[PDB]
Structure formats: structure tokens, C-alpha cells
């Protein structure tokens, strides 16, 4: 059913160029990939310092084409499966677009992928803002960040 | 405090070209504009059928530049005032990007505009999925869309 995710990307007010994606299923499965298709030269200051250095070394199989990431996610999210898929992220409007654009325009999103991502911050605030683990060491690694989202959600719903 | 909004747009897997935006405040105030800058030619069948027909005539003052719409919104959302700005939309991920892209990069969004839009669909499900009035036939007009969201938010929360 539930997947927690995060993306890193280069966004210029016009497009969102996907750097990486981390997704963690409530059942414990984890997916992380980094795109071979974004242009590192086009990254602004904040990304160069905080995002770029934390990426896998160049020879890692974690590096995948946009097409591989799409096919990886269709398998990882079980899009042909029994269960209803429910996507979650923390302040994920841009993340939601970044994920969806792996498929193309919204019309080309697979029929079982939700057309919205639930907002963890919204749930957090609606439960009166309960005390959370402080920020992990490596924030801006999308998988670490996606992990911490699931941790947060479990706390709030315990 | 709370604003409810909707955007209409041409989205192609690459960009989100803003057509119109409708915003309604909890205090009764309303804003609506249509961008002079999208290219009607690029629109798909759906946007040709359901969106373009509801737009104001060419002479309407509702047609504005993207620059004018930014300035209008900075005023309307009371960006320099002391209330916390809360934004709400129904299934608003692309809407949130469309709105925020009026300021360019996320970098450049006024500090006082929140970095996320609250998701009215999520709220609905949370409180038990209570039965809602039907959507207006007028929907697909971003202002009508935004008013209706405000109405749904009122009904969903009416015993909170
Ligand atoms: Mg992100
Ligand atoms: Mg590819
Ligand atoms: Mg996020
Ligand atoms: Mg909309
Ligand atoms: Mg539209
Ligand atoms: Mg809306």
C-alpha cells in the first residue's frame, strides 16, 4: 500500500531536472537511483555543495537512465498488482511532479499510480506536531530522507 | 490565514504553462486572472474542450501578464502582513508548482509564502470521507474551482 519518497532535482522555474530518487515501502523494501541524464553543469550553488558530493561514485549500478528508473519504479511500486498504491512525501509538490514526469505528461501516468501524493507535514501538523527525531547526518541523500519520512510517519501513527 | 486556489495549465511532461488561477480567502476576498502568455495552439483536446471555452473574452481586464499576476498575488496574499499564509488546493501538486513558478525558481518565492500546499483530498479522507455536494458544472473555471474547495473545506471541518 504505502510508499514514502523524496527526490533531489535542479529546478529553474521552468523545468525540474531529476537528480535522484529514494522510495521506501512501508513493508521495508527500498529503492534508490541517480539519473545519468541530468546535467551537473546546470546545478546552482546549494545543489553543488549539498547534493552533488553525496551521490554514488560514477561506476555504481545505482546510476540509471530515466527509462530504467521508470521501469524500476513500475516494478518497485507493483503497478500491475493487488494493492492500492498510496504515495507519501514531506512538502512534496515538486517531488510529485519530478516523479510523475518520469512517465511524461500526467495523462501517461500508469492507471494505479495516484494523481496526488499525501503530504506528511500536513498529517504531522494535524496531529498537533508531535516530537520528531532530529534531522539525520546526511540530509539531501534522497534515500536517507525517504527513510526518515517513513520513521516520522510511524511515530505520528503510533 | 487560509486561501483556497486552483490553476488551469498546459502540461507536457516538461513544462507547466499557466492558463489561469483562482484564489479565494476565508474572509470573502477573491482573485482571478488569465495569463496572456500561454499559447492556446499547444493545448490538448481536454484543455480545448473543458478549459479554453470558460475563459473570459479578449477585452476582459482578467487577462494579465505573468508579471502582473505575481504582483497581484503578492498584494492579495498580504505577503508583508502578520497572518500566517496557509494555502489549500484539491489534488494540488501541479497547482502548487504552477503558482510558485510565477516567482521563478523555488529559491525566489517570498519567505512568507509556504513551501507546500495543504491537500484538501487528504483532509477529506482523513475525516471519514463524508459525502460532499456535487462539483459545479462551471468547474473548470479556476475561480469556481477555488470557491468550491473553500465550501468543501467548510463542510469537512464543520464539527472539528
Ligand atoms: Mg525533495
Ligand atoms: Mg532514458
Ligand atoms: Mg520532499
Ligand atoms: Mg487544477
Ligand atoms: Mg488543466
Ligand atoms: Mg484546487
From Swiss-Prot, chain B:
It is an enzyme of class 3 (hydrolase). Mg(2+) binds at residue 6. It comes from the Bacteria. Its cofactor is Mg(2+). Keywords: Exonuclease, Hydrolase, Magnesium, Metal-binding, Nuclease. SUPFAM superfamilies: Ribonuclease H-like. Binds 1 Mg(2+) ion per subunit. Its EC number is 3.1.13.-. Residues 6-9 are annotated as: RNA binding. InterPro entries: 3_5_Exoribonuc_actinobac, RNaseH-like_sf, RNaseH_sf, Rv2179c-like. GO terms for molecular function: 3'-5' exonuclease activity; magnesium ion binding; nucleic acid binding; RNA exonuclease activity. Homodimer. Exonuclease that cleaves single-stranded 3' overhangs of double-stranded RNA. This is 3'-5' exoribonuclease MT2234.1. It comes from Mycobacterium tuberculosis (strain CDC 1551 / Oshkosh).
Amino acid at each position: 500500500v504505502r510508499y514514502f519518497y523524496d527526490t533531489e532535482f535542479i529546478e529553474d522555474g521552468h523545468t525540474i531536472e531529476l537528480i535522484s530518487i529514494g522510495v521506501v515501502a512501508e513493508d521495508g523494501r527500498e529503492y534508490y537511483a541517480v539519473s545519468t541524464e541530468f546535467d551537473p553543469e546546470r546545478a546552482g550553488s546549494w545543489v553543488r555543495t549539498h547534493v552533488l558530493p553525496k551521490l554514488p561514485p560514477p561506476a555504481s549500478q545505482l546510476w540509471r537512465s530515466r527509462q530504467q528508473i521508470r521501469l524500476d519504479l513500475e516494478e518497485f511500486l507493483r503497478i500491475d498488482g493487488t494493492d492500492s498504491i498510496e504515495l507519501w512525501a514531506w512538502v512534496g509538490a515538486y517531488d510529485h511532479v519530478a516523479l510523475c514526469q518520469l512517465w511524461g505528461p500526467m495523462t501517461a501516468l500508469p492507471p494505479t499510480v495516484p494523481r496526488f501524493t499525501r503530504e506528511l507535514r500536513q498529517l504531522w501538523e494535524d496531529r498537533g506536531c508531535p516530537r520528531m527525531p532530529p534531522r539525520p547526518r546526511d540530509v539531501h541523500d534522497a534515500l536517507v530522507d525517504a527513510r526518515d519520512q517513513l520513521r516520522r510517519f510511524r511515530l505520528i501513527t503510533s
